[PDB]
Symmetry: C3
Subunit: 275 residues, 3 copies
């Protein structure tokens, strides 16, 4: 049944995996520094390796200036053998969470942990490594997806994606937090490979501060951005301003409607267009 | 102060294994607890009966020569409750999805739910599309499941973002071709829902689309808004912003701007004459 | 390798036991147990683990509180275990907090909820009603979700999908039912006003426009802003269920302004209806 560690003076009771390089050399980048793992029973044996596991791995060859390490969790899909086990959860040394379900990456890329390393293993990728350390990366064939499942019970189904702007920083000892600043933005939009590389988003919805905030003024706008055919510049086209004006984001430039997609009728209180 | 270390001094790996069988040396079972690691904390003179925080390995499918199926969950216990009401709030499915199921969200009878497939099974009136399994992150919370993106300025700019990353090709094979964003690339943000029989497709959305295949000096996009009419179950594009920035209706002679009791106040345009 | 076995096909589990000082009850955020790689420098191991799973107490333990939570620690390439990062926190309430390098000081290593973050950083004041709602990502400046969507043989179709229903999975009954009216899916921005975070002040929302049934599932899409000098987020412009693009109030919101005019308007009727 059970197997314990105890610490009766109320110190902590911890388990450690120790591991070296070949010939007492320093441990290596992506070397498996330790692991915990179910092996299940086939009938008369156990599986050769674990079918579900927590792995600790090195990030960089270890040294006096690098104790780099990262984590991953491995699962095995119903109806496959541990040959096709999947390191689906990767907690990068930088702290990003990569989520890589079955189908998404070949097991030769099992040790990919960052955009930097993905760029290395797949030289045609070329995604912006400045995006490393920014949080959650999901990789799935075709249709990577977030599902927000929202039973009413007794109130309201209100799933939400909520950006939270503030001034200041939680990274230092000071820990000033302060009022939302101008040029605060919340972009939802699409980057993509142009055949050379990924770069900046080229179509977006953005929610922006339109102003610095204080406790009785919190202006926002909502802006829609596209990129023109033959361009690589994402441009604001239409926004809703803080006063609720729907507008083009530049004067004398963008139509409403076109010849083969005309508005059916316009309702405005003033019957005269103001030019 | 009291450490317990496995060591491998030739620089092999040093791993820990949980071994587990079925009854009477039978093959291990679906959702059978194949192993576990777990804090038990001290009440005053005893430990809790089970762990209050734990990593569990579980079987997915009865084990066999063609099924080594396994999955993971992490259990926590909320402040002010006993381990009776401990919560398997992190579930890493055998398909590789992450399910995130906080306190309040699922009854503990559904502690072993690991996919839309199994959720449909346990809750027969659910009927959600199991084709969505394997797609990444599922969050389940009563009423208000939520992603919070907390964005301190420090010295630059509060710029939280949700960023789709379109490409051609695949990371799943050995070739590993990656290539230019294709046409009919999309990034949909929208709402599915139960119709009283089932969940199905989204019925209102914002989408960012490729409007074109891409290359390094042309990366066209559009943004499109979709709704479903009362009495219909068809989600339809209504208004978009095109790659040239035209705000338009997504069909000719069909959608109004304004209505009788919600009129625009004034229109500003350079041409004072509507083109018909 | 080091294996525990259970040959009668009971379960084979590993337990960390831990007490308070002098056989006292274990404490809030006390490290109740752990598993941790220590790697080899050349002639020694690192002093603590460079990657680890920690179990911690939530609340002083008691007959009515067995509170516990989990975190995973990593160490970034080119730094020592001094600057290791508890980047994954699974709160006692069940939320997942994701806190990469650069995001929080190590003094806030034990932060596990908005409640406890408010405590450690008294100027924060974020709404603790948001605890238990799922995923919180904290990064300096640019917290981000990336959805990476290789075509292979079909279509690049990344998606963020709200799933409305009636009923509840929390009880034993487990009624699930049709999407109700005032169902919403908001994507938008809260922020500090200099006192506190509160509700979102600009948003896109997808709404139910109606209760649903198996032949009618109406939606609208609505854009909300807040005016300069206000703290009220207000619907401004929506796309209705019939596809009408409208202002969300009569005689109130312009299309265009004097220094940002539409270039041309195309409509079938050449006469504005007033």
């Amino acid at each position: 049944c059970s197997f314990g560690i105890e610490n009766t003076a109320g110190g902590s009771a911890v388990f450690h995996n120790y591991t070296r390089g070949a010939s007492n050399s320093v441990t290596k980048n992506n070397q498996l520094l330790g692991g915990y793992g179910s092996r299940p029973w086939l009938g008369s044996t156990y599986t050769e390796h674990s079918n579900a596991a927590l792995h600790f791995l090195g990030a960089g060859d270890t040294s006096a200036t690098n104790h780099g390490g990262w984590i991953r969790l491995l699962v095995t899909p119903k109806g496959k053998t541990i040959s096709d086990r999947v390191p689906a959860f990767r907690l990068s040394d930088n702290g990003d969470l990569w989520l890589v379900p079955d189908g998404a990456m070949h097991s030769d890329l099992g040790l990919v942990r960052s955009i930097e390393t993905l760029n290395a293993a797949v030289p045609r990728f070329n995604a912006p490594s400045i995006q490393d350390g920014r949080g959650l990366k999901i990789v799935a064939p075709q249709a990577p997806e977030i599902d927000l499942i929202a039973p009413r019970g007794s109130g309201a189904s209100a799933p939400a994606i909520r950006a939270m702007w503030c001034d200041g920083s939680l990274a230092d000892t000071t820990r000033y937090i302060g009022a939302t600043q101008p040029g605060s933005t919340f972009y939802i939009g699409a980057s993509g490979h142009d055949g050379e590389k990924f770069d900046s988003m080229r179509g977006s919805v953005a929610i922006k501060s339109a102003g610095g905030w204080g406790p009785t003024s919190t202006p926002t706008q909502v802006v829609l951005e596209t990129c023109e055919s033959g361009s690589i510049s994402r441009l604001p086209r239409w926004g809703v301003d803080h006063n609720g004006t729907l507008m083009p984001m530049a004067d004398n430039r963008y139509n409403l409607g076109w010849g083969s997609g005309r508005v059916k009728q316009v309702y405005a209180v003033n019957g005269t267009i103001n030019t």
